[model samples]
Target: HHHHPVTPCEAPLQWEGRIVLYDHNTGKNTRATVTYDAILQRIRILEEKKSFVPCKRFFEYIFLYQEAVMFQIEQVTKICSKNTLTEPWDPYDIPENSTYEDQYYIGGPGDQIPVQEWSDRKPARKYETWVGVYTVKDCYPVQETYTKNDSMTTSTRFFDIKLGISDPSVFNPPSTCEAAQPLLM
Candidate 1:
């Protein structure tokens, strides 16, 4: 079996999936739909946060990591603000720094298959930990689990995935985001 690596730096990758963020301390949960692309380092998140208020809070986030800009919209208020990403992360990949951890067969969205999961730890993001699962069959990502030395442990199970950017405007800012100046950090 050709065990190709999934996390290729500068790869034109697109993943549309759902993620659940669980807080270990408070046992809280936050759910979101994530649309991500790696080449340009852009991500859009639509989340329904359940931990803060009694009612569900809907939020939309657009992060342009390459441009060091981020925008968020609170659905309840329609308040959208563009903020500067103070810290820019250098592009990294799994094969280079991550140590191979596990190799096993796991049931994926399609079926059970042999997969390799690698553990990636970064000291910059306050000691972040990330493990991504991949299928060696056609070099596909099955899922990923992540956690930092923080309250939130994040996991995204893959479903809809594609290569290359479908549209240029996927990372385009909304009208409010276009007009507003960069907000507070």
Candidate 2:
């Protein structure tokens, strides 16, 4: 994997910004542009060759005030090498034999006594790695470290975060792209 250091931007909410990424194994570097539109409930991400539209399928009927529900479209050719299931698509249904885990945290970075540090261990997985996380006062992630059980790879750090996004057009897709469905049912 390759690892690239991404430069963070200040006043990102006012316009578009780019984040640099590196792969530790491949030694490759790339960047992605991020934009958000809260009023329209849209987010557009422009990558090297692929642009991502975070709008969910048939999202028109969904009333998204400040956030958009996104979904991935996948084609199922066969189920266990058998015929496909005979069920019409229902977006709200979770797939069978699926597990859900929700990580919830309270308090903000402005708290006088913030829950400042934590570590997680993944023993169930074949590889053993201890992940450490450090946060700023309002719970902003300041640094994250990953140490493998027995690997020469050093822990990676991502820092220099600048927040707020302001561009109106950044939230919208490209003009050549298909327009979003109407907000009405």
Candidate 3:
């Protein structure tokens, strides 16, 4: 529903962490290191041997700080951009039938603590589908999942989150590799 031309920078305020991606259809697991520089509006995803440098605008939604509690929910609504669906409701508006529970997640320095979780689904497009589960600690997203209703892909999970990046060199391409810069449009 969202589309944009990819444009590809360097600045500060970053996050560096490992991500394990599991594809349900292919039954493959791939690992990578993801780096985000909010101020510069850039993302560097490093795999075992290859790397990808993409502009932050390429993403439908990009959260500046994953650990920071403050986030603009409007960003998500704008990304989805489907007029057939209704506006997002309040997070506090728990339905009478909805279920909530306490959960634990390994955060930052790998410490586990009790957190809150909410599971529910609402109207999307034409039908109601499983929206997956959401886990939060101190208002920051600890873990979340999204399942494609029309595809065989079950879900995607993101965990083992560490915040705050210190090295500026992480934003630069490896010295040994030739980095390509796109021609300005």
Candidate 4:
């Protein structure tokens, strides 16, 4: 009963943004461009995993929840991989159990804004914790940091967000995806 807010901010139904992720557990980082449509339950992510060698390769993953399918296309080879989805796709979404903390401002100059902070603990993980930063003015999630009991941490930051998808066709699978290889193929 000591906790404050009874409501959580809503994220845009459709949006696109850039994401940078660092996994301290693996000492790896990934940078990606993301497009999400909550109304349609679809998500598209184009990522480059920096720690991978054979050189940094670009991979685009599309999750179509309504169709219950996932397609990943490799840029250089144009080879597509397919998989089946049994659940909705979410990108760094804060769980309902997450608790609101307080407000604080971030950034250096013209980009600064006051943001709200929320923290969550995973009961299944014996209380693995996550803290999220959300832009108050836009009610958009700006960043999330997670740490496990073993002290492995991961941080993800979001920026350059546009509140709606500019191209509906971005969700369409490429022709190569038709005969796309299986998850391991």
Candidate 5:
């Protein structure tokens, strides 16, 4: 559990913009100019554990990219909603492989899972159900990451999915229902 590195005024190092060269043989983008604001926002979000929505958005982007490469209607609409951004929109035309494994299923540290808040109205010795156990004990929300293979680039993006529960006692104390990690690796 490290503390947030940035102060209200500071940003992360990677956010700094710099122009680097890419090696065509390695298929890696290099010598690209990184921007300050870009790195700053990334650090801020990572420090705050706000990467869930963005990860999902990235998945949508990958779908758009694949559609463009193959000339298709794009599967984005099915995964997410559409704005008035206009039809025949190609979000994947941009450079670089945006494909990432949706890592939103994995549970990690610092994730706040939803749990049942305890109440005094119930007796301490009350017969507890699975959910009731959570209500009596205070637990935090759980964080999860889901990983998916990108059909476009064959890469993976591990996205985060947070599950919130009304009761926290579903798992161990001080942990939320969402905090329970899956048994499978």
Candidate 6:
């Protein structure tokens, strides 16, 4: 979530004891070496290998946060599915191939009975679907950026509709969920 500097004249914040070094061949930092004060201006260096790179670590952080976010979404969705719905209220009963809308079919009071046929079914439009899902997925980026950068502007910027995905395109589809990001970290 650290903003890439537009110019090298800007000094890297050195107090955190971590540094990201970019090697030419790779587009991202290939190393995360550390140099810091051992005691009040006394310099110390911790030479972490290229494998411990910051970009990798950053993606790892994002991935881990994504899983946590998804877990929370599923948890809340489960609660809504249970308490707010009636007889056919079983989101957990969805098949492996179920779409996002299919998984969210909670039979609540006055809510339309869920259509069973995938082809014949008129799924909720993309905007409505996003209104339902992105509040959760979007939290991943927000929480991750905030935790790492802690900049109010950057955090707020990431959550903005224009800066981030609004309609759930194939790239941002709910079913594309994966937790592999954290494992690399």
State how far residue 64 of model 6 sits from its true place (Å): 37
Candidate 4, residue 137: the lDDT equals 77
2 versus 4: better TM-score goes to: 4
Q: Tens digits of per-residue lDDT for model 5 on 16-79? A: 2222223333453222211222211211011111234332221111112112221111123222
Which candidate do you rate higher for TM-score, 1 or 5?
1
lDDT of 4 at 162: 92
**Candidates sorted by lDDT, best first:** 4, 1, 3, 2, 6, 5
Ten consecutive residues with minimal summed lDDT in candidate 4? 48-57
Location of the lowest summed lDDT over 10 successive residues in candidate 6: 138-147
**Candidate 6 lDDT tens digits, 1-185:** 64432321211112322333333333343222222221222222223334434432121111112122211113112211111111221111122332333212335888733222111113553211111111222111111111122222211111122222222221121332432222221
In the range 6-82, model 3's lDDT, one tens digit per residue, is: 21011124466555557677775555566556555444444442345332222122222323211111221222211
Q: Using Cα atoms with residue i matched to residue i, what is each candidate's TM-score against the true structure? A: 0.68, 0.34, 0.42, 0.80, 0.15, 0.16
Task: Go through the candidates in order and give each one's C-alpha lDDT.
Answer: 0.64, 0.33, 0.39, 0.79, 0.21, 0.23
> What does candidate 4's lDDT look like per residue over 1-185, in tens digits?
34576776766678988988899877766789998888888989888655536554578888999898889888778888988897656655556667777887787788878888888754466554688888777778788888755678889888899988998887998988876555532
Candidate 3 colliding pairs, count: 0
Q: Please identify model 2 stretches exceeding 4 Å from their true place.
A: 1-18, 36-43, 46-120, 126-134, 143-160, 179-185
Clashes of 4: 0
Residue 99, candidate 2: Cα error in Å is 19
Residue 148 miss distance in model 5 (angstroms):
6.3
- Cα deviation at 170, candidate 4, in Å, is 1.3
lDDT string for model 2 (1-185, tens) is 52221321121222234444444555544444544333354444444433564422221011223433332111121111111223332211112222222123446676533223333434466642333233323333433334443553334333343445655544333233232322221
Candidate 6, overall lDDT?
Answer: 0.23
Query: How far does residue 153 in candidate 6 sit from its true spot (Å)?
Result: 29
Q: What is the lDDT for 145 in model 2?
A: 38
Worst ten-residue run, lDDT, model 3?
A: 3-12
